[PDB]
């Protein structure tokens with residue numbers, strides 16, 4: 743079930759899944775439609791679901807990681823697609839080898855130095871590239 747803010751933006755949550763508290767490398771996942779492309783893992787908030795809960799849930803589903811939820815980085819809109827994503831830091835403390843999306847759709851994941859994450863997100867997911875700006 744998709745949920746929506748009162749303005750009709752689909753509600754989403756995501757995490758910047760960093761390898762360590764140094765926040766130098768982040769985990770991206772492949773696009774579900776176009777697997778040669780990378781994205782920040784995230785997805786729809788469910789009804790009555792806290793965003794931090796959704797974020798953590800989605801990165802579990804899409805990236806197969808768990809960790810220490812850190813700060814909310816921010817709330818990011820994609821105007822073209824009409825969705826609004828709460829983006830948290832998550833310091834990955836657990837990397838699961840098989841996860842929901844790896845199994846169901848063959849989703850991939852890869853660590854990128856922040857600057858390289860930005861680079862590969864830029865073309866198709868520039869909003870996501872912007873998650874890293876600060």
Ligand SMILES: O=P(O)(O)O[C@@H]1[C@@H](OP(=O)(O)O)[C@@H](OP(=O)(O)O)[C@@H](OP(=O)(O)OP(=O)(O)O)[C@H](OP(=O)(O)O)[C@H]1OP(=O)(O)O
Nearest residue numbers: 752754772773774775776781784785786787800804823825
């Ligand atoms: O079809 P796209 O290019 O517009 O992007 C796709 C994006 O695909 P991706 O970024 O992987 O290429 C999906 O992401 P996902 O399939 O990787 O999860 C994402 O779904 P979502 O992340 O919002 O939702 P869930 O993760 O499932 O809860 C949305 O797909 P959906 O129509 O199945 O809910 C998104 O579509 P829009 O929100 O309409 O932009």
Ligand SMILES: [Cl-]
Nearest residue numbers: 762765766767
């Ligand atoms: Cl790191």
Ligand SMILES: [Cl-]
Nearest residue numbers: 820867869870
């Ligand atoms: Cl986006």
Ligand SMILES: [Mg+2]
Nearest residue numbers: 784785786804
């Ligand atoms: Mg998703």
